[PDB]
Enzyme design. Structure first.
Site, PDB file in Angstrom:
ATOM      1  N   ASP A   1       0.860  -1.178   0.000  1.00  0.00           N
ATOM      2  CA  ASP A   1       0.000   0.000   0.000  1.00  0.00           C
ATOM      3  C   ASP A   1       0.897   1.229   0.000  1.00  0.00           C
ATOM      4  OD1 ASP A   1      -1.649   2.184   0.602  1.00  0.00           O
ATOM      5  OD2 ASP A   1      -2.824   1.118   2.094  1.00  0.00           O
TER       6      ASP A   1
ATOM      7  N   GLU B   1       1.354   2.704  13.431  1.00  0.00           N
ATOM      8  CA  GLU B   1       0.323   2.474  12.431  1.00  0.00           C
ATOM      9  C   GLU B   1      -0.646   1.509  13.106  1.00  0.00           C
ATOM     10  OE1 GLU B   1      -2.098   1.221  10.633  1.00  0.00           O
ATOM     11  OE2 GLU B   1      -1.032   0.257   8.935  1.00  0.00           O
TER      12      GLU B   1
ATOM     13  N   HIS C   1      -5.385   0.011   1.445  1.00  0.00           N
ATOM     14  CA  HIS C   1      -5.864  -1.296   1.875  1.00  0.00           C
ATOM     15  C   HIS C   1      -6.971  -1.204   2.933  1.00  0.00           C
ATOM     16  CE1 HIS C   1      -3.368  -0.640   5.433  1.00  0.00           C
ATOM     17  NE2 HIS C   1      -4.005  -1.667   5.976  1.00  0.00           N
TER      18      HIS C   1
ATOM     19  N   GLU D   1     -10.034  -3.741  15.486  1.00  0.00           N
ATOM     20  CA  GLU D   1      -8.837  -4.303  16.123  1.00  0.00           C
ATOM     21  C   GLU D   1      -8.538  -3.595  17.450  1.00  0.00           C
ATOM     22  OE1 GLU D   1      -8.727  -7.018  14.397  1.00  0.00           O
ATOM     23  OE2 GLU D   1      -6.787  -7.045  13.301  1.00  0.00           O
TER      24      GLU D   1
HETATM   25  N1  LIG Z   1      -0.568  -4.049  22.144  1.00  0.00           N
HETATM   26  C1  LIG Z   1       0.320  -4.332  21.179  1.00  0.00           C
HETATM   27  N2  LIG Z   1       1.663  -4.421  21.433  1.00  0.00           N
HETATM   28  C2  LIG Z   1       2.575  -4.740  20.424  1.00  0.00           C
HETATM   29  N3  LIG Z   1       2.154  -4.906  19.117  1.00  0.00           N
HETATM   30  C3  LIG Z   1       0.812  -4.795  18.880  1.00  0.00           C
HETATM   31  C4  LIG Z   1      -0.113  -4.505  19.894  1.00  0.00           C
HETATM   32  N4  LIG Z   1      -1.359  -4.435  19.329  1.00  0.00           N
HETATM   33  C5  LIG Z   1      -1.252  -4.684  17.991  1.00  0.00           C
HETATM   34  N5  LIG Z   1       0.085  -4.925  17.730  1.00  0.00           N
HETATM   35  C6  LIG Z   1       0.732  -5.147  16.415  1.00  0.00           C
HETATM   36  O1  LIG Z   1       0.722  -3.900  15.764  1.00  0.00           O
HETATM   37  C7  LIG Z   1       0.863  -4.087  14.347  1.00  0.00           C
HETATM   38  C8  LIG Z   1      -0.088  -3.171  13.585  1.00  0.00           C
HETATM   39  S1  LIG Z   1       0.088  -3.334  11.766  1.00  0.00           S
HETATM   40  C9  LIG Z   1       1.423  -2.099  11.564  1.00  0.00           C
HETATM   41  C10 LIG Z   1       2.759  -2.781  11.317  1.00  0.00           C
HETATM   42  C11 LIG Z   1       3.992  -1.911  11.037  1.00  0.00           C
HETATM   43  N6  LIG Z   1       4.158  -0.791  11.945  1.00  0.00           N
HETATM   44  C12 LIG Z   1       3.870  -1.295   9.669  1.00  0.00           C
HETATM   45  O2  LIG Z   1       3.433  -0.129   9.606  1.00  0.00           O
HETATM   46  O3  LIG Z   1       4.166  -1.935   8.649  1.00  0.00           O
HETATM   47  C13 LIG Z   1       0.604  -5.567  14.102  1.00  0.00           C
HETATM   48  O4  LIG Z   1       1.827  -6.175  13.717  1.00  0.00           O
HETATM   49  C14 LIG Z   1       0.074  -6.089  15.433  1.00  0.00           C
HETATM   50  O5  LIG Z   1       0.493  -7.405  15.722  1.00  0.00           O
HETATM   51 MG   LIG Z   2      -4.182  -1.820  10.582  1.00  0.00          MG
END
Ligand SMILES: Nc1ncnc2c1ncn2[C@@H]1O[C@H](CSCC[C@H](N)C(=O)O)[C@@H](O)[C@H]1O
Ligand SMILES: [Mg+2]
Ligand SMILES: Nc1ncnc2c1ncn2[C@@H]1O[C@H](CSCC[C@H](N)C(=O)O)[C@@H](O)[C@H]1O
Ligand SMILES: [Mg+2]
Lengths: 324, 324
Positions: free
Chosen positions: A18, A110, A267, A119
């Site tokens: 994306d 993100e 996305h 989520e």
């Molecule tokens: N409480 C938490 N502590 C650590 N990671 C978390 C979390 N809640 C969600 N996540 C993680 O946060 C991510 C969000 S998706 C974003 C992924 C990355 N920063 C990027 O931009 O490419 C996912 O990998 C999910 O597993």
């Molecule tokens: Mg997301």
């Protein structure tokens, strides 16, 4: 050997491919070079690590890349491959219990899901802000805005009318299948994630909430429901199918990452709220209502949207949706 | 009211909007006007009823449209809407226990699933043939053929190489993610349903089985496994990702409905059998093997494919797949 990690790679593939999302973060981080240079950053939910590497490339002195899912192992390999193992530290597990050796000058994350809050990751970012962010520190992105618009979904219109077109293509009348298709595609209470375009938008999009992410009280606003009222006037004659919800986030300088159907696709697509059946509207038909984004009581990870709406002189109605 | 029938409409929408499939049946039935006119037909798995109406339009005197799923109710409405309630009779439930008032001159059925035999509906057609078809009666389609080809899946190649392209688009090296992506997308034993094109086909497709549907012994061939050996020579240098399987069926006159990637796309797409990782091949690399289509022992509705293959001078290998 056989592995069961298809969905793990595919979700991160979808995010990195994306370009709107990934370039907006890349540039939003770079734009904050002055606030990040020689400073420390916490990347909440670091995933494959790309945002933490962006922060290091923006001048950050040290980055803690915290990731709860199994993909954290890939992030540590990506960090090493980019020669950053001395400055970017990958910490597995939830940010709520990670141990950092210092508080940080900035948090990048993100965290947004479908309909912004599916989520429910925002609460983790705010927990990290309270626990680890220095006073006056920086949050990236800094704000989010929520938008709603009535829609005449062209693809849905085609799927519904398809059954009355069968006669024209095969010489068999199937127009009675339209009531059935409408019940099945619209007579349900699921939020549908679908990408629209401007062709689908039936009135000027309305901003119904603005979230300053660092603001006092937001963690409790999220439990009680985020949203507000809206009002608009239809552009023209069309079947109203319901409403689309989308969001933007802003990086202070500002750079805006939008998921609007009027803007380049992402996305996240949009979150669609279908009425039980189409409602005919015309130019200047007034539509008003209220949208509330809520955690679902069964699965607080799961977005719930409560819709109240009034179309023209019809009575106000209510429909309670939960994420597909 | 809320209904839970989205998937019911969507599957029948996908089949009827598949013009290759639906027009091939329409014409294959019309081509048998001489054998159907004034005669009786059993439509096995009538769905929304369209093939039974085609048969009536081809001259059939009486059609029994037998359908086990909930969509049978829609078929009875479609029949009435086309004025055929006196000649097309919709009977709910499995053809194995339906009671017809007569044996029939012909059976029509759209029974094929992904990889031809996923859903294992052919046994129901053959049961109906033994129980209800008059001696010398007509089966439509009358035969099926199975094909295999080695493939270099262009889309998969892009997804795998994507991680080594990240540096060129964002200035972050993610090439270590390639081994991970390969494990997740290829190191599994699931049959992948995906539509290919001629660009993906690495050698001349090989017919590995031909099923005359009325033949003695086929019901027992289906339990023991349908298939055979194959051999081919690669067109050029490319990463071999595995094999695609597809089928055609033939209506006697003959009209062929093909699901080949070299032919117009259909909703069956093709059934893809990925190796655990890509194998480099060159012009004239010899590939041989054997393909067997089997019912899965856990869920006999579920297609299993046993692949034996030998690429060049490598040792022969085996991979046992089950439908996604
Ligand atoms: N409480 C938490 N502590 C650590 N990671 C978390 C979390 N809640 C969600 N996540 C993680 O946060 C991510 C969000 S998706 C974003 C992924 C990355 N920063 C990027 O931009 O490419 C996912 O990998 C999910 O597993
Ligand atoms: Mg997301
Ligand atoms: N044993 C059985 N008896 C009756 N219907 C069956 C059956 N096994 C499968 N089916 C039905 O057969 C159909 C196959 S899909 C084909 C539908 C229709 N003939 C059309 O061409 O549009 C499905 O609707 C499925 O529910
Ligand atoms: Mg089928």
């Amino acid at each position: 050997l056989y592995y069961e990690c298809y969905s793990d790679v595919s979700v991160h593939e979808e995010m990195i491919a994306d370009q709107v999302r990934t370039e907006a973060y890349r540039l939003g981080i770079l734009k904050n070079w002055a606030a990040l240079r020689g400073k420390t950053v916490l990347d909440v939910g670091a995933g494959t690590g790309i945002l933490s590497i962006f922060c290091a490339q923006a001048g950050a002195r040290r980055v803690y890349a915290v990731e709860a899912s199994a993909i954290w192992q890939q992030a540590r390999e990506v960090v090493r491959l980019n020669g950053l193992e001395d400055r970017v530290h990958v910490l597995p597990g939830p940010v709520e219990t990670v141990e950092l050796p210092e508080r940080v000058d900035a948090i990048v994350s993100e965290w947004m899901g479908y309909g912004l809050l599916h989520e429910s990751m925002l609460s983790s970012v705010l927990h990290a802000r309270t626990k680890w962010l220095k006073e006056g520190g920086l949050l990236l992105p800094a704000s989010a805005e929520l938008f709603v618009a009535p829609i005449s979904d062209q693809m849905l219109e085609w799927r519904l009318g398809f059954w009355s077109q069968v006669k024209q293509h095969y010489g068999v009348d199937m127009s009675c299948m339209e009531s059935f298709a409408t019940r099945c595609l619209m007579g349900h209470s699921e939020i549908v994630v679908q990408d629209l375009s401007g062709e689908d938008v039936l009135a000027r999009p309305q901003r119904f909430a603005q979230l300053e992410l660092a603001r006092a009280g937001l963690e409790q606003e999220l439990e009680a429901g985020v949203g507000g009222r809206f009002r608009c006037s239809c552009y023209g004659s069309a079947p109203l199918h319901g409403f689309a919800v989308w969001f933007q986030v802003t990086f202070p300088g500002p750079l805006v990452l939008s998921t609007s159907p009027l803007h380049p696709a992402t996305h996240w697509k949009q979150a669609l709220l279908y009425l039980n059946e189409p409602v005919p509207v015309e130019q200047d038909t007034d539509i008003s209502g209220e949208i509330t984004l809520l955690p679902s009581p069964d699965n607080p990870r799961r977005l719930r949207i409560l819709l109240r709406y009034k179309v023209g002189d019809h009575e106000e109605k209510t429909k309670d949706f939960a994420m597909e």
